[PDB]
């Protein structure tokens, strides 16, 4: 299964 | 033995040709199990291995959500990154993400990964400790400071040490017959004379799993690396791999040379002779 | 910017035996960017209905793909593969040899 959070902008 | 789960994301900006193309692929060792393509009709994470097909819609719903959330973040980041390197709207650019975890034979965490790349070159990477970041350039340093303030490393470590290894456990159990298999290579040898005094001796290894193999040439027992040609371990297309090793030998001396095949699926290494 | 030439490999799924059903494979790797044109050829003509693997990459960010089609080899028919990328000035054609 994939990573949900973080997902923060560069 | 030791296993790994890995995810590979690719975001490619297409100026004028609409919105960026996002492709996500998931692997358990050398087996691709999931896919996502922003160009496909489904607009869902799709199964690519039989053992993942047993997952219910709540799995596919969550995986689709995660992957679309990253595709959207990449869409904005593509813009941010071209402002960083001061690039025009005109050009096409690439963002690549690699992440995953390795487990021991006990099924416990060994090491985690997360690394990003902009236009093929290393951008930002999570360090072995999963607590600090490594910025490859001046632009990446801005991302590093942003990610430090947002405590991105804690959230990444929480996944890599936690959820990542837990999914791998679930996958290894549900796909034991496939993932824990050791397919041995189907070995054969070919001889092709190049000159009246020279000949090519090629050794084959077909239909093996995992991809890890060692092909070596030997002359009367002594190791041979001089005049040896090797091909990159290639996929067969059925979930197995192929590889060949060739050597240029003097005509009539073909019986002196032996090929040694080393694979996990072999009880003892094979010795092939013409 | 990173520009890497694709490495081409044309081969079959199983060892080539005339009249028997097989798969013609084309493995493009080590390339950057992802934008690539890969076609499978039967006597210089483009084979229709050629499927491919999902875009993936190496530890050094170099992409790789497997293009494949179900085929039945014959002594008469010549199979090859046409590949084009930004690093290539013109489409590169790699002929299929039964022992490579
Ligand atoms: K070109």
Kindly describe this structure.
- The complex is a heterotrimer of chains A (10), B (274) and C (100).
- With 10 residues, chain A is mostly loops.
- In chain A, 0% of the residues lie in helices and 0% in strands.
- The N and C termini of chain A lie far apart (23 Å).
- Chain B has 274 residues and is α+β, with helices and mostly antiparallel strands.
- In chain B, the strands form 3 sheets. In chain B, strands 4-3-2-1-5-6-7-8 form an 8-stranded antiparallel sheet, covered by helices on one side. In chain B, strands 9, 10, 13, 14 and 15 form a 5-stranded antiparallel sheet that branches.
- Helices cover 24% and strands 41% of the residues of chain B.
- In chain C, a hairpin with a 7-residue loop joins strand 8 (79-84) and strand 9.
- Chain C is an all-beta fold.
- In chain C, 0% of the residues lie in helices and 44% in strands.
- Chain C has a single domain, classed as Immunoglobulins (Immunoglobulin-like).
- Chains B and C meet through strand 1, strand 2, strand 3, strand 5 and strand 9 of B and strand 2, strand 6 and strand 7 of C.
- The complex binds potassium ion.
- Residues 84, 86, 88 of chain C line the site of potassium ion (K).
**Fraction in helix of chain C:** under 10%
Instruction: Examine the secondary-structure arrangement and name the CATH architecture of chain C.
Output: Sandwich
Q: CATH superfamily name of chain C?
A: Immunoglobulins
User: What is the number of helical segments of chain C per DSSP (H or I, 4+ residues)?
Assistant: 0
CATH class of chain C: Mainly Beta
Region (Alpha-3) (chain B): 183-274
GO cellular component, one term (chain B): lumenal side of endoplasmic reticulum membrane
GO molecular function, one term (chain B): beta-2-microglobulin binding
Protein name (chain B): HLA class I histocompatibility antigen, A alpha chain
From the structure above, extract its key features.
heterotrimer, A: little secondary structure, C: mainly beta, Immunoglobulin-like, 5-stranded antiparallel beta sheet, 4-stranded antiparallel beta sheet, 9 strands, 0% helix, 44% strand, elongated, binds potassium ion, amyloid (chain C)
């Amino acid at each position: 299964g994939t990573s949900g959070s973080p997902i923060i902008n560069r | 033995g030791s296993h790994s789960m890995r995810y590979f994301y690719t975001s490619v900006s297409r100026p004028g040709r609409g919105e960026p193309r996002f492709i996500a692929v998931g692997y358990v060792d050398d087996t691709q199990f999931v896919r996502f393509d922003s160009d496909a009709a489904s607009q869902r994470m799709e199964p690519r291995a039989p053992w993942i097909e047993q997952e219910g819609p709540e799995y596919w719903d969550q995986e689709t959500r995660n992957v679309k959330a990253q595709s959207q973040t990449d869409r904005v980041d593509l813009g941010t990154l071209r402002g960083y390197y001061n690039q025009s709207e005109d050009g096409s650019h690439t963002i690549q993400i690699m992440y995953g975890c390795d487990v021991g034979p006990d099924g416990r965490f060994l090491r985690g990964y997360r690394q990003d790349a902009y236009d093929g070159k290393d951008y930002i990477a999570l360090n072995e400790d999963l607590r600090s970041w490594t910025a490859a350039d001046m632009a990446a340093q801005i991302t590093k400071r942003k990610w430090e303030a947002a405590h991105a490393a804690e959230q990444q470590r929480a996944y890599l040490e936690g959820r990542c290894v837990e999914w791998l456990r679930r996958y290894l159990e549900n796909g034991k017959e496939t993932l824990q298999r050791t397919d041995p290579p189907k070995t054969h040898m070919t001889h092709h004379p190049i000159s009246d005094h020279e000949a090519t001796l090629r050794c084959w290894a077909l239909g093996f799993y995992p991809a890890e193999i060692t092909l070596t040439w030997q002359r009367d027992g002594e190791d041979q690396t001089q005049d040896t040609e090797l091909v990159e371990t290639r996929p067969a297309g059925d979930g197995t791999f192929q590889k060949w090793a060739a050597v240029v030998v003097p005509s009539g001396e073909e019986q002196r040379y032996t090929c040694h095949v080393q694979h996990e699926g072999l009880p003892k290494p094979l010795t092939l002779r013409w | 910017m990173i520009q890497r030439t694709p490495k081409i490999q044309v081969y079959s799924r199983h060892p080539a035996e005339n009249g028997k059903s097989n798969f013609l494979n084309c493995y493009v790797s080590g390339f950057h960017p992802s934008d690539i044109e890969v076609d499978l050829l039967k006597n210089g003509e483009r084979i229709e209905k050629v499927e491919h693997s999902d875009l993936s990459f190496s530890k050094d960010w170099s992409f790789y793909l497997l293009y494949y089609t179900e085929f039945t080899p014959t002594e008469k028919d010549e199979y090859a593969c046409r590949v084009n990328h930004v690093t290539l000035s013109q489409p590169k054609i790699v002929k299929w040899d039964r022992d490579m």
